[PDB]
RNA sequence: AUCAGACACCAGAAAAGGUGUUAGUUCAUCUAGACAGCAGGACGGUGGCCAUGGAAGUCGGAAUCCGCUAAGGAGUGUGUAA
RNA sequence: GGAAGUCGGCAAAAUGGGAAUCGAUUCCCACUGUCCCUAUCUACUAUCUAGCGAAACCACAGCCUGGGGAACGGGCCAGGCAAAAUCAGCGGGGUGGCUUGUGGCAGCCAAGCGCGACGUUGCUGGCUCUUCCUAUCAUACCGAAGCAGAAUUCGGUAAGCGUUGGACCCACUAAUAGGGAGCUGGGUUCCUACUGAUGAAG
RNA sequence: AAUGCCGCGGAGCUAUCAUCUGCCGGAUAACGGCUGAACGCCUCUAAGCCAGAAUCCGUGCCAGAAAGCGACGAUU
RNA sequence: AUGUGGAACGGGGUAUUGUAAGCAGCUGCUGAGAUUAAGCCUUUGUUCCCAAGAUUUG
């Protein structure tokens, strides 16, 4: 059983949005 | 003036934490950017308003619970003067009220700007700008809140005085037997110690005599304690109970006590003082005796002799200044009063009860005490109805005779 | 969005489904816990709701607002003729539950209990239990073997008893047969008690004793299909859930009234059963003109407080309370003062015709 | 006020069952049991 | 009860029998209690606990440091200051006093805004008197007329905090 | 003069009635009230744990003296039989068919003279004189009709309202042939009868009665000896 | 003010306690195995729990102290209770 | 504390026949004539249920017609008579022919001195002061 | 891990907290006896001076010196009206 | 009991009426199932039966949870599940892992890497409805506080159970806590679900 | 006489407009402790243990798998 | 499916209403008359009817 309050599995928009904005973070720190 | 009913004042940090925690817990928490701008504005407006309401609610509670020094009996007002510096207390209370108005002004200002919030963020910071200003306002009265809490704690300790009632103020030299007289007269447990000025503050104790209750107020011996003692007798319809050490066993000279009493006579005027000769068992006094109002009653403090007589004399002085043959049964003339400890005392139904299960379980037998030719039938059931008639309508001690008379009559009719 | 004005739920979720009971006879879904410290005793009885009346009793309730006053209470009268024990069932405890290992029947079975096995007694050739009677007469050693099996392996002993419905003034001829668990004693003791009680009648005088607290269980009156108004007390896109009140069956559900007090266990052969120490006035529990829609009570009867589920002439099961509960209401004695037996078929005004005749004039008839 | 699920209420209810308040039920059962 | 009645009770009857040993045990196990609190609690209470433990930790590090060396609708959406007025400037968003902080003096004075010269974001807002970030506003300096630049955003912060041009 | 509370109520006259030959206490509450009465009158007069019409206001429902007792119409037969069995033979009991059921409120009666509600029925007055064997007089107390509730009677003393005038004080004393004092009971409550029950040799008042009031009742009732 | 009443049954394996701050209740404990409770006459109102298992004796002590607990009263003034005074061995 | 204030005994459940907005007769000699019911003490949280009172219940009352100084106080009132029939616990059904009540303080002693008309014994038992100052108790 | 992890630059919360564990880096004393533990000493000028009802190191204002040493701080806290 | 209902005497009963202000409004009296609070009675329909006998609509159909980048859907993914044939009801179904409790300017430090953290100092919409969440108003149990007692404040576990009646106001109440997922007023000029009822069958 | 109008009106239905009924076993959370290390002291915790909330799980109560089952009776 | 069998009426009890028509002389017959199970109780009362037709079942 999950035994959690928040699901450990992520949606495809959410997982795609990390690589969208993680790269921009490296752009900003550059 | 029971000053115990004042709610306890939190320090500035707990006050802010309680207010902010209440705002978080009692108001809605979740909002999304996609919501209508009216709902966003209303959302943050509620938090600012709710936080304003919690702060004033607490601050008003302080401002109302504290006693208004001007509206109270000048005995207590001057007592609060010597202890708390009315000006400092008044400044502290005014600072909170000025804070309260400031908390209201900031909230009204930020609610007004929130009506024009265009994005979820610009409302978010007005709320953050709001609550921070509300908090920074409160943080500035750290001294005032701390001061009021200390005042609160000592206020709850003060005795509940009532100058309206009959009183008898007891003042004199420190540890000069006044504490012993107060302890012997009133039920108050006044501590007696070799240390001088053991009674730091006043001690009020009630005493019942002459079908009335008198509130004897013992004052500090004679500083702040001396000032409080003076103000205690300053405004009080009572009589002085000065106790002078006759044998000087209290450590104070008799002449010094007489001189102090003469100096304090200006405030002790319009009262019937007492020239108590304390420590009797253990010249200058002529001038004091020349006043006449002082009652020269010997007080054998070591032997505890004369305390009751002195108290009775003081109470009397204060009061002055302010055919049907009842056939009682013979058993009544020799009835032993029901006192529990004695063995000869009979039992009561209360004791039968605690033995037989106590309140709610014991069934009292109502029938158990019937005057009756037998104790056995004492639980019988008397027939009430029979064949449409009550048995009661027919209960007659000679009813057998009416039945026999009748027999003869029916025997006549059949014949 | 939240509900603005809230109220408690209009129904009870613990009593649904509101479907018709699959039985007419009250089922015992729980028998009182057994104990070997106490030897044998029964735990249930089967009666018929004749009718209900009201009584006056002196209330000896310590601490009450009406301590030692005369109180009026409604009472239900259930006729309880003695029931004949005709069988014993052994139950073995298994990791899957209580399982009926075997059953032993008495040799002579009355037509009362034989009618239970048929939907039409007249067309049948009455062949039931005939070969069982033959083998009982031939060899009793076989029957001794099943009883040995019951007392050796089984952990719960129950007796099959049927009510003598013939004695009651009921138009039904089938007897109601049920199992009463023999609580108390060892399994051998229960088996013996069943053996010496075969074919003999056990009466309510031996089951209950006029003061204890019992659970009365039965099927309620049928009100037919009803809308949400009287079935349930009713004043986002989704699908309708089970919690939403709906229209359907109202009535004829299996119910259990707890904590019923017997005010009196009267004997049918006695003619003083409706008379008390404060009343005299020889009378019977049957009201003047007979019970409405039931008849005349001529056998042993039980008078319970309050009301019991189901209409008149329906079968009720009376079981001993599962759990001891020593509320002083459950522990106090009862001393009846007066019982009402006026005509319930209308506004009755007289208790018995005898005492009505003195008040009324000489009727021409 | 505490409900019936209260562990305290269960405890002194058990205390009542532990004493003579249930002994009136034992001899009550024994009477019919013997007769 | 009069004045310090509880220590009169303490003096006359003593304190509770187990108080000293119970408080010793509680103080001893407080070390484990703090760590248990830090590892169990979640949410705001954890977060305030985290921030207050950081504050106290930095504080105790500083005093042990101090111990050391001593031993050694056409409407305007921005706040404005007071045909051509085609848009609506709410009197609510309008402001009249600003907190101008002197650079050299380092003193913040709340003074009225005499006027606004130009808004760097939009010169059109200068006519309407809209105060934005970096806007130039002139205020009276008699109590200290001088110009200043807005150091914050009046729309968001609400209070017009500006830095004097001196 | 003693202080007692029925349950936690200051009105003991309502829940009890006391005479010179018997005592009546309410039933079904706490017998601590019965316990207190027995502690002072158990060895002198019988104490009856009685109710009147299934009710506990027996003090204000029944009026009596050392000779006889009266009960209202609402008195049940069982309770009347209970009272007769409890009380001794030389005491007589009477039902009253009075419209004014509150006998304890309409009749204030001592062993020799009784003063009654002005609008009492003639038949009630005649049977009162027959049973109580006292002279009956129709008059109001301080302009107030409830004589039994607003006035307490004993053989040697009595109390009335503090609202009565001095001339009313003198007239009432002259018509009663007993010393009478204007006073109050239970700390300012002008229901003297409801707050006080007195026989010829002892007095009971509520626990909230002041010390001054107790001294007044003791002074008028001469109970120090 | 209220003396505490102590009763010992089944040679000290069950302790009944009465009148703790004027209680009408009967607080009953059953001692853990290996523990016997006695009342010593050397000092008044002295309870002694003797046994072999330290855990059983000391857990019995904790049970007594916690069951005789003051509720809703100010403990800075209300000092009534039962407390462990000395811990040691029989010899 | 007003709710069961100085009751000196519990009341049995009685049929409610005087809800709020009721207009009902004053029974004391204090001078008031008519009373208007504003609220009843001891009513919980029942949705849409109109607050109601029975004999011996204490209500909030306004003197519609009466002496002016008797007015301008929402004064506690004790309902002493009720027209709706109710079951006395002994079994008999009772109903007085008019709805009557008395003006009383929150503590439980009225401003009046004598009650005109019959008094329910339930009222007289929860309120010993009314019983003390009642003329006929039925 | 009494709401573990399988996540995917662990990038939003993110700054950090933990008497949880395993590894390291830099400084410390240690058979001239290490840390801890129990036994004891922890002083005398001196109750240093203003400050006070009462303050003796410990309500409170600058230090805070000395005879002895192996060490006893005008004193780390509790506590005492003192 | 007598408009307490509703935005409101809509509709009935009093037979509709008495006085005021500008037909309308208000007031007092009067009446009444609008309401507390629904219950009962009658006729018709609905139900079944004999006869007759349509139409709209129709890719195919028919359970829910999480995901399927979106539009989440019924078809796809992973699960819960899943047993013929039916009857009568009622109508449900035709866009940040956001966000929350702590404001803006300047200076002083300074763990450390010109910044520099915490600190520190300077100033001005309402009527009824099923369920869920806890972020708890009350009830249960605890800790702390000048908490003597009573009453009370704050905080913890806790959503089991309650959280009203009237025109922000005034009462009751232990309390009148906050939110998520059939209807009307003033304001701008088939099938499936749910609920009951049968029902072939080892 | 389309229930002409009125009074009473059994039976049935019904009314917090009437009456009755609504119960006990474990496991825990906050929290209070026992023994006891880690760390030669200490420690409610690490291994274990005790007490402990209207909480959770059962008992009780309702339904009875129409594809879960047992015993008994007869068997053309 | 021949039985303490059932049904239709009848009597009695119990209830509802209120004292009938008629005979008469408001009064008496006359607390009478009418109704009473259609979801009231009872029946040595009379009469009547049933030991039958079909269907499915190893």
DSSP string, C32-100: PPP-SSS--B--EEEEEEEEEEEEEEEE--TT-TTTTEEEEEEEEEEE---EEEEEEEEEEEETTEEEE
CB C41 within 8 A of CB D32: yes
Q: At what angle do helices E44-71 and B12-26 cross, to 10 degrees?
A: 160
Domain residues for the domain of G17 are 1-91
Q: Which residues have CB under 8 Å from C155's CB, separation 6+?
A: C91, C92, C93, C98, C187
- Identify the three-state secondary structure at position F224: coil
B382 touches chain F (CB under 8 A): yes
Q: Is the dihedral of CA E121, E126, E131, E136 positive or negative?
A: positive
B110 and B173 in a single domain? The answer is no
Which of B210, B349, B382, B397 to substitute to test the interface with F, most F CBs within 10 Å? B349
Structure tokens at E1: 């009860």
**d(C-alpha E68, C-alpha E62), whole Å:** 10
Please answer yes or no on whether F86 and B370 come within 8 Å at the CB atom: yes
Nucleotide nearest to C248 (CA to C1'): J196
Are chains F and D in touch, 3+ Cβ pairs below 8 Å? Answer: no
**Cβ contact A5 with chain I strand, < 7 A:** yes
Q: Which residues have CB under 8 Å from C85's CB, separation 6+?
A: C106, C159, C160, C161, C194, C197, C198, C199, C200, C201, C202
CB B227 within 8 A of CB B71: no
Q: CA separation (Å) from C244 to B83, C121, C247, C252, H137?
A: 68, 46, 10, 21, 52
Q: Is residue B345 part of a domain?
A: no
β-bridge mates for residue E81, sequence order: E95
Give me the CA F59–C1' K24 separation in Å, rounded: 47
Please answer yes or no on whether C66 and F27 come within 8 Å at the CB atom: no
β-bridge mates for residue F49, sequence order: F25
Q: How far is CA F203 from the centre of its chain?
A: 11
How far does C359 lie from chain B, in Å, by closest CA?
A: 9
**d(C-alpha F116, C-alpha F139), whole Å:** 7
Structure tokens at E85: 């007025």
Cβ burial of D21 (10 Å; 0-12, 13-18, 19+) is middle
Nearest to B381 among C68, C278, C328 (CB): C278
The three state secondary structure string of chain B is CCHHHCCCCCCHHHHHHHHHHHHHHHCCCCCCCCCCHHHHHHHHHHHHHHHHHHHHHHHHHHHHHCCCCCCCCHHHHHHHHHHHCHHHHHHHHHHHHHHHHHHHHHHHHHHHHHCCCCCHHHHHHHHHHHHHHHHHHHHCCHHHHHHHHHHHHHHCCCCCCCCCCCEEEECCCCCCCHHHHHHHHCCCCCCCCCCCCCCCCCEEEEEEECCEEEEEEECCCCCHHHHHHHHHHHCCCEEECCEEECCCCCCCCHHHHHHHHHHHHHHHCCCCCECEEECCCCCHHHHHHCCCCCECCECECCCCECHHHHHHHHHHHHHHHCCCCCCCCHHHHCCCCCCCCCCCCCCCHHHHHHHCCCCCCCCCCHHHHCCCCCCCHHHCCCCCEECCEECHHHCCCCHHHHHHHHHHHHHHHHC
Q: What is the DSSP letter of F52?
A: S
Closest residue (CA to C1') to nucleotide K60 in the complex: C30
Q: CA separation (Å) from C56 to C70, H92, H116?
A: 6, 11, 34
B27 and B139 in a single domain? The answer is yes
**d(C-alpha F152, C-alpha F13), whole Å:** 10
DSSP assignment string, C22-33: S-SSPP-S-PPP
Tell me which chain C residues have a C-beta less than 8 angstroms from the C-beta of B353: none
Give me the CA C235–C1' J38 separation in Å, rounded: 10
**Cβ contact A29 with chain I strand, < 7 A:** no
Are chains F and A in touch, 3+ Cβ pairs below 8 Å? Answer: no
How far does F63 lie from chain B, in Å, by closest CA?
A: 19
Tokens 């079904």 correspond to: F28
Domain residues for the domain of B43 are 12-157
**d(C-alpha C182, C-alpha C295), whole Å:** 33
CB H31 within 8 A of CB H24: no
**d(C-alpha F51, C-alpha F57), whole Å:** 8
Structure tokens at B128: 């953050």
**Residue B142 sits in a domain of what CATH number?**
1.20.120.1190
B362 touches chain C (CB under 8 A): yes
B150 and B188 in a single domain? The answer is no
β-bridge mates for residue C161, sequence order: C85, C178
Q: Which residues of B195-229 are buried (b: 16+ CB within 10 A; e: fewer)?
A: eeeebebbbbbebebeeeebbbbbbbbbeebbbbb
Nucleotide nearest to C26 (CA to C1'): K62
Structure tokens at B231: 């103000």
**d(C-alpha H129, C-alpha H135), whole Å:** 12
Chains that touch B (3 or more CB pairs under 8 A): C, E, F
Structure tokens at F200: 């010829």
The three state secondary structure string of C193-235 is HHHHCCCCEECHHHHCCCCCEEEEEEECCEEEEECHHHHHCCC
- The phi, psi pair for B29, rounded to 5°, reads -115, -35
Q: Which residues have CB under 8 Å from E20's CB, separation 6+?
A: none
Tell me which chain C residues have a C-beta less than 8 angstroms from the C-beta of H12: 65-66
Give me the CA E41–C1' J66 separation in Å, rounded: 30
**d(C-alpha B308, C-alpha B305), whole Å:** 8
Please answer yes or no on whether G75 and E16 come within 8 Å at the CB atom: yes
**Cβ contact E144 with chain J strand, < 7 A:** no
Nearest to F30 among B328, B332, B359 (CB): B359
Task: Please count the structural domains in chain H.
Answer: 1
> Nearest CA to H9 among F54, C338, G64?
F54
Structure tokens at E79: 């706040």
Please answer yes or no on whether C326 and D17 come within 8 Å at the CB atom: yes
**Residue B230 sits in a domain of what CATH number?**
3.40.50.300
Structure tokens at D23: 């002994």
- Identify the three-state secondary structure at position C302: strand
Residues of B within the annotated binding site? 172-179, 218-222, 278-281
> Nearest CA to C265 among B385, B363, D35?
D35
CB H61 within 8 A of CB H103: yes
**d(C-alpha F63, C-alpha F131), whole Å:** 11
**Cβ contact E15 with chain I strand, < 7 A:** no
**d(C-alpha F159, C-alpha F113), whole Å:** 15
Please answer yes or no on whether B350 and F32 come within 8 Å at the CB atom: yes
Q: Is residue B365 part of a domain?
A: no
**d(C-alpha B397, C-alpha B395), whole Å:** 7
User: Which pairing describes strands F2-4 and F203-206: parallel, antiparallel, or unpaired?
Assistant: parallel
**d(C-alpha C21, C-alpha F135), whole Å:** 77
**d(C-alpha B276, C-alpha B178), whole Å:** 9
DSSP assignment string, E59-91: HHHHHHHHHHHHH---B--S-BB--TT-SB--T
- Measured in residues, chain F has a length of 225
Q: Is residue B75 part of a domain?
A: yes
**Minimum CA–CA partner of F60 in chain H:** H132
Element (H, E) at E110: strand E108-118
Q: Is the dihedral of CA D9, D11, D14, D16 positive or negative?
A: negative
User: What share of residues in chain A are helix, strand, coil (percent, to 5)?
Assistant: 60, 0, 40
Tell me which chain C residues have a C-beta less than 8 angstroms from the C-beta of F76: 70
- The phi, psi pair for H62, rounded to 5°, reads -120, 130
Give me the CA D13–C1' J201 separation in Å, rounded: 53
CB H80 within 8 A of CB H56: yes
- The phi, psi pair for E56, rounded to 5°, reads -70, -40
The three state secondary structure string of H65-105 is CCCHHHCCCCEEEEEEECCCCEECCCCCEECCCCCEEEEEC
Q: What is the DSSP letter of E95?
A: B
- Measured in residues, chain D has a length of 35
B210 and B316 in a single domain? The answer is yes
F27 touches chain C (CB under 8 A): yes
Would you list the domain boundaries of chain F? 1-225
- Identify the three-state secondary structure at position H61: strand
β-bridge mates for residue F3, sequence order: F205
Cβ burial of B46 (10 Å; 0-12, 13-18, 19+) is middle
Are chains B and C in touch, 3+ Cβ pairs below 8 Å? Answer: yes
Q: At what angle do helices B12-26 and B120-139 cross, to 10 degrees?
A: 150
Task: Please count the structural domains in chain B.
Answer: 2
CB C274 within 8 A of CB C297: no
Are chains C and F in touch, 3+ Cβ pairs below 8 Å? Answer: yes
CB C162 within 8 A of CB C84: yes
CB B126 within 8 A of CB B113: yes
Chain I nucleotides near the protein (CB, 7 A): 3-12, 15-20, 53-54, 80-81
**d(C-alpha B277, C-alpha H133), whole Å:** 58
User: Which pairing describes strands B276-278 and B243-245: parallel, antiparallel, or unpaired?
Assistant: parallel
Please answer yes or no on whether H12 and C65 come within 8 Å at the CB atom: yes
**d(C-alpha B278, C-alpha B174), whole Å:** 12
> Nearest CA to F200 among F26, F12, F100, F65?
F65
β-bridge mates for residue E88, sequence order: E75
CB B22 within 8 A of CB B101: no
Strand I neighbours among B 196-235, CB < 7 A: 196-198, 200, 223, 225
CB H95 within 8 A of CB H86: yes
CB C153 within 8 A of CB C90: yes
> Nearest CA to F193 among F135, F149, F154?
F149
**d(C-alpha B231, C-alpha D10), whole Å:** 61
**Minimum CA–CA partner of E9 in chain G:** G77
Please answer yes or no on whether C70 and H89 come within 8 Å at the CB atom: no
- The phi, psi pair for B363, rounded to 5°, reads -95, 110
Q: Which residues have CB under 8 Å from G25's CB, separation 6+?
A: G18
CB B384 within 8 A of CB B393: no
Cβ neighbours of C2 (radius 10 Å): 4
User: Which pairing describes strands G35-40 and B212-218: parallel, antiparallel, or unpaired?
Assistant: unpaired
Q: Which residues have CB under 8 Å from F147's CB, separation 6+?
A: F105, F106, F107, F108, F115, F116, F117, F139, F140, F141
Residues of B within the annotated binding site for GTP? 172-179, 218-222, 278-281
- The phi, psi pair for B244, rounded to 5°, reads -100, 135
F95 touches chain B (CB under 8 A): no
Give me the CA A8–C1' J68 separation in Å, rounded: 17
**d(C-alpha E130, C-alpha E95), whole Å:** 9
Resolution in A: 3.1
CB F188 within 8 A of CB F7: no
Q: How far is CA B229 from the centre of its chain?
A: 22
> Nearest CA to B190 among B158, B157, B218?
B218
Domain residues for the domain of H44 are 1-138
Nearest to H132 among F60, F72, F74 (CB): F60
Cβ neighbours of C353 (radius 10 Å): 10
Nucleotide nearest to C313 (CA to C1'): L39
CB B243 within 8 A of CB B278: yes
State chain B's maximal CA–CA distance in angstroms. Answer: 124
First-to-final CA distance of chain B: 98
β-bridge mates for residue F197, sequence order: F204
Cβ burial of C315 (10 Å; 0-12, 13-18, 19+) is buried
> Nearest CA to B9 among B92, B85, B75?
B92
Q: At what angle do helices B37-65 and B12-26 cross, to 10 degrees?
A: 140
Cis peptide before C308 (omega within 30 of 0): no
**d(C-alpha C155, C-alpha C188), whole Å:** 10
**Cβ contact C249 with chain J strand, < 7 A:** yes
**Cβ contact A19 with chain I strand, < 7 A:** yes
Give me the CA C282–C1' K24 separation in Å, rounded: 46
DSSP assignment string, F109-166: E-SSEEEE-TT--HHHHHHHHHHH-SEEEE--BTTBS-HHHH-EE-SS-EEE-SSS-H
B186 and B247 in a single domain? The answer is yes
CB G52 within 8 A of CB G33: no
Give me the CA B266–C1' L13 separation in Å, rounded: 108
Strand L neighbours among C 258-317, CB < 7 A: 288-296, 311
**Cβ contact C238 with chain L strand, < 7 A:** no
Tell me which chain E residues have a C-beta less than 8 angstroms from the C-beta of B204: 2
Cβ burial of D22 (10 Å; 0-12, 13-18, 19+) is middle
Task: Please count the structural domains in chain G.
Answer: 1
First-to-final CA distance of chain E: 65
- Identify the three-state secondary structure at position F68: strand
CB C315 within 8 A of CB C26: yes
Please answer yes or no on whether C71 and H47 come within 8 Å at the CB atom: no
- Measured in residues, chain E has a length of 166
Please answer yes or no on whether B383 and C277 come within 8 Å at the CB atom: yes
**d(C-alpha B78, C-alpha E65), whole Å:** 49
Q: Which residues have CB under 8 Å from C279's CB, separation 6+?
A: B383, B384, B385, B386, C337, C338, C339
Structure tokens at G74: 């100010």
**d(C-alpha H38, C-alpha H51), whole Å:** 9
β-bridge mates for residue E164, sequence order: E148
**Cβ contact E38 with chain I strand, < 7 A:** yes
**d(C-alpha F207, C-alpha F8), whole Å:** 10
Q: Is residue B99 part of a domain?
A: yes
């Amino acid at each position: 059983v999950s035994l959690k309050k928040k699901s450990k599995r992520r949606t495809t928009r959410l997982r795609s949005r990390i690589e969208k904005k993680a790269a921009e973070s490296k752009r900003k720190q550059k | 003036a029971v000053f115990k009913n004042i709610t306890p004042i939190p320090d500035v940090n707990t006050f802010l934490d309680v207010v902010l925690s209440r705002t978080q817990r009692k108001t809605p928490t979740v909002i999304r950017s996609g919501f209508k701008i009216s709902r966003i504005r209303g959302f943050y407006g509620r938090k600012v308003k709710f936080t304003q309401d919690t702060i004033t609610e607490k601050l008003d509670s302080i401002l109302q619970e504290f006693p208004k020094l001007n509206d109270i009996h000048p005995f207590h007002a001057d007592l609060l003067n010597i202890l708390y510096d009315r000006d400092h207390l008044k400044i502290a209370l005014s600072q909170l009220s000025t804070a309260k108005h400031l908390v209201e002004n900031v909230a009204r200002d930020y609610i007004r700007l929130l009506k024009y919030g265009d994005s979820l963020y610009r409302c978010k910071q007005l709320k953050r700008a709001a609550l921070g200003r509300m908090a920074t306002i409160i943080k500035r009265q750290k001294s005032s809140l701390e001061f009021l809490e200390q005042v609160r704690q000592h206020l709850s300790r003060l005795p509940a005085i009532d100058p309206n009632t009959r009183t008898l103020l007891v003042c004199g030299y420190p540890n000069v037997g006044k504490s012993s007289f107060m302890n012997k007269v009133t039920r108050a447990q006044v501590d007696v110690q070799p240390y001088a000025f053991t009674t730091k503050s006043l001690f009020v104790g009630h005493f019942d005599y002459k079908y009335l209750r008198w509130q004897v107020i013992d004052t500090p011996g004679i500083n702040t304690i001396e000032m409080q003692s003076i103000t205690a007798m300053a405004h009080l319809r009572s009589a002085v109970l000065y106790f002078m050490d006759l044998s000087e066993m209290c450590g104070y000279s008799v002449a010094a006590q007489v001189k102090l009493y003469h100096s304090i006579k200006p405030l002790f005027a319009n009262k019937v003082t007492i020239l108590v000769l304390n420590k009797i068992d253990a010249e200058l006094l002529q001038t004091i005796i020349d006043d006449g109002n002082v009652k020269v009653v010997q007080t054998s403090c070591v032997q505890d002799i004369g305390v009751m007589d002195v108290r009775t004399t003081a109470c009397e002085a204060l009061l002055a200044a302010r055919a049907r043959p009842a056939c009682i049964p013979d058993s009544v003339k020799t009835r032993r009063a029901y006192d529990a400890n004695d063995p000869n005392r009979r039992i009561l139904a209360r004791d039968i009860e605690a033995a037989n299960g106590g309140a709610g379980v014991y069934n009292v037998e109502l029938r158990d005490k019937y005057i009756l030719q037998d104790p056995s039938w004492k639980y019988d059931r008397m027939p009430e109805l029979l064949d449409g008639k009550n048995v009661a309508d027919f209960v007659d001690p000679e009813i057998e005779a009416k039945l026999l008379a009748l027999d003869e009559e029916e025997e006549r009719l059949e014949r | 969005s939240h509900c603005k004005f809230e109220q408690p739920r209009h129904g009870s979720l613990g009593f649904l489904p509101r479907k018709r009971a699959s039985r007419q006879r009250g089922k015992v879904k729980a028998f009182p816990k057994d104990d070997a410290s106490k030897p044998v005793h029964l735990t249930a009885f089967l009666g018929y709701k004749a009718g209900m009346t009201h009584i006056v009793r002196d209330l000896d309730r310590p601490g009450s607002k009406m301590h030692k006053r005369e109180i009026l209470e409604a009472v239900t009268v259930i006729e309880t003729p003695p029931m004949v024990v005709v069988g014993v069932v052994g139950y073995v405890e298994t990791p899957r539950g209580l399982r009926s290992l075997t059953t032993v029947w008495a040799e002579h079975l009355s037509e009362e209990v034989k009618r239970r096995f048929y939907k039409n007694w007249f067309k049948s050739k009455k062949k039931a239990f005939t070969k069982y009677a033959k083998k009982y007469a031939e060899s009793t050693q076989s029957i001794n073997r099943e009883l040995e099996r019951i007392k050796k392996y089984c952990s719960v002993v129950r007796v099959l008893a049927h009510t003598q419905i013939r004695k009651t003034p009921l138009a039904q001829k089938k007897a109601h047969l049920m199992e009463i668990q023999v609580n108390g004693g060892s399994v051998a003791d229960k088996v013996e008690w069943a053996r010496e009680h075969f074919e003999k009648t056990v009466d309510i005088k031996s089951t209950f004793e006029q003061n204890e607290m019992i659970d009365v269980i039965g099927v309620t009156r049928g009100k037919g299909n009803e809308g949400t108004t009287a079935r349930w007390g009713t004043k986002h896109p989704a699908n309708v859930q089970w919690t939403v009140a709906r229209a359907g069956n109202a009535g004829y559900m299996h119910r259990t009234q707890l904590n019923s007090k017997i005010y009196r266990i009267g004997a049918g052969d006695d003619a003083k059963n409706a008379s008390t120490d404060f009343d005299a006035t020889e009378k019977r529990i049957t009201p003047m003109g007979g019970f409405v829609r039931y008849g005349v009570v001529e056998n042993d009867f039980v008078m319970l407080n309050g009301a019991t589920p189901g209409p008149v002439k329906r079968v009720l099961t009376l079981r001993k309370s599962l759990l001891t509960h020593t509320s002083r209401k459950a522990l106090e004695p009862v001393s009846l003062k007066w019982i009402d037996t006026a005509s319930k078929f209308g506004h009755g005004r007289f208790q018995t015709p005898a005492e009505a005749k003195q008040f009324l004039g000489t009727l021409k008839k | 006020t505490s409900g019936p699920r209260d562990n305290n209420r269960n405890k002194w209810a058990k205390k009542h069952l532990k004493k003579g308040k249930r002994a009136k039920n034992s001899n009550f059962s024994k009477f019919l049991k013997k007769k | 009860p009069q004045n310090e009645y509880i220590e009169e009770s303490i003096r006359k009857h003593g304190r509770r029998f187990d108080h000293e040993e119970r408080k010793r045990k509680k103080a001893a196990r407080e070390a484990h209690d703090a760590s248990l609190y830090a590892q169990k609690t979640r949410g705001i209470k954890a977060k305030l606990y985290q921030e207050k433990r950081r504050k106290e930790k930095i504080q105790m590090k500083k005093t042990i440091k101090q111990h050391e060396e001593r031993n050694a609708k056409r409407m305007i959406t921005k706040a404005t200051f007071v045909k051509y007025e085609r848009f609506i400037r709410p009197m609510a968003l309008r402001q009249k006093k600003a907190n101008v902080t002197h650079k050299e003096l380092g003193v913040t004075m709340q003074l009225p805004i005499i006027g606004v010269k130009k808004n760097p974001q939009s010169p059109t807002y200068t006519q309407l008197g809209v105060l934005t970030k970096g806007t130039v506003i002139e205020v009276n300096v008699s109590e200290l007329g001088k110009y200043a630049q807005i150091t914050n955003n009046p729309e968001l912060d609400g209070c017009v905090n500006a830095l004097l041009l001196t | 003069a003693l202080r007692a509370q029925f349950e936690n109520s200051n009105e003991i006259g309502v829940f009890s009635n006391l005479t010179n030959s018997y005592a009546l206490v309410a039933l079904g509450g706490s017998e601590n009230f019965y316990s207190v009465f027995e502690a002072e009158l158990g060895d002198v007069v019988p104490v009856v744990h009685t109710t009147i019409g299934g009710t506990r206001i027996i003090g204000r429902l029944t009026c009596g003296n050392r000779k006889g007792l009266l009960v209202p119409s609402s008195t049940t037969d069982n309770e009347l039989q209970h009272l007769r069995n409890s009380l001794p033979d030389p005491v007589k009991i009477q039902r009253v068919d009075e419209r004014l059921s509150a006998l304890g409120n309409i009749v204030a009666c001592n062993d020799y003279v009784a003063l009654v509600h002005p609008d009492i029925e003639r038949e009630t007055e005649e049977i009162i004189a027959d049973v109580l064997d006292v002279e009956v007089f129709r008059q109001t107390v301080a302009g107030n009709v409830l004589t039994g509730s607003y006035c307490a009677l004993s053989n040697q003393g009595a109390l009335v309202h503090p609202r009565t005038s001095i001339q009313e004080q003198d007239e009432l004393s002259s018509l009663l042939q007993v010393p009478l004092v204007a006073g109050t009971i239970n700390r300012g409550s002008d229901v003297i009868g409801a707050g006080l029950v007195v026989n010829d040799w002892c007095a009971f008042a509520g626990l909230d009665t002041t010390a001054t009031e107790l001294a007044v009742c003791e002074s008028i009732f001469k109970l120090q000896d | 003010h209220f003396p505490i009443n102590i009763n010992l049954t089944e040679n000290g394996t069950v302790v009944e306690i009465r009148n703790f701050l004027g209680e009408r209740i009967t607080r009953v404990i059953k001692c853990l195995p290996g523990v016997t409770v006695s009342i010593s006459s050397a000092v008044k109102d002295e309870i002694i729990l003797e046994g072999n298992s330290l855990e059983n004796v000391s857990q019995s002590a904790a049970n007594i102290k916690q069951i005789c607990n003051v509720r809703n009263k100010d403990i800075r003034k209300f000092l009534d209770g039962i407390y462990v005074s000395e811990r040691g061995n029989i010899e | 504390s007003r709710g069961r204030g100085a009751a000196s005994g519990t009341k049995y459940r009685m049929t409610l026949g005087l809800p709020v907005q009721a207009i009902m007769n004053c029974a004391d000699n204090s001078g008031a004539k008519n009373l208007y019911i504003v609220s009843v003490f001891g009513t919980g949280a029942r949705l849409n249920r109109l607050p109601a009172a029975s004999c011996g219940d204490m209500v909030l009352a306004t003197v519609k017609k009466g002496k002016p100084d008797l007015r301008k106080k929402i004064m506690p009132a004790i309902v002493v008579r009720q027209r709706k029939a109710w079951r006395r616990k002994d079994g008999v059904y009772l109903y007085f022919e008019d709805n009557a009540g008395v003006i009383v303080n929150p503590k439980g002693e009225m401003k009046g001195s004598a009650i005109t008309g019959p008094v329910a014994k339930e009222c007289a038992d929860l309120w010993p002061r009314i019983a003390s100052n009642a003329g006929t108790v039925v």
